[PDB]
């Protein structure tokens, strides 16, 4: 749905996130066209040195079907993952928005 995208390359994600209308925290979860079940989280944020940037985080998979960006905290699915980082940055560069 709105935050989930299939087959979107790293650079397409970059163009989409950097478009006017997007703010810090704007983000999207993308699935690799080649390796099904392989997800990445792309976020818009501000770098003091760089300026507006798009960061990329690798979502890893558990053997039980679940996910995590940091072993510290795991989730049963992509929704729960979004609900958490949406509420706390918890390790990320900034909380997600929308």
């Amino acid at each position: 749905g709105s935050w989930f995208f299939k087959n979107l390359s790293r650079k397409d994600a970059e163009r989409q996130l950097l478009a006017p209308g997007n703010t810090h925290g704007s983000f999207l979860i993308r699935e690799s066209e080649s390796t099904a079940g392989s997800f990445s989280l792309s976020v818009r944020d501000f770098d003091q040195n760089q300026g507006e940037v798009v960061k990329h985080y690798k979502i890893r998979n558990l053997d039980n079907g679940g996910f995590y960006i940091s072993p510290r905290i795991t989730f049963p699915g992509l929704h729960e993952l979004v609900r958490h980082y949406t509420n706390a940055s918890d390790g990320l560069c900034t909380r997600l928005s929308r």
Binding site: S40, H56, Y57, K58, S70, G91
Partner: peptide, 8 residues
């Protein structure tokens, strides 16, 4: 490697 952000 791709080059993903390091997290703690």
């Amino acid at each position: 490697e791709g080059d993903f952000e390091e997290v703690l």
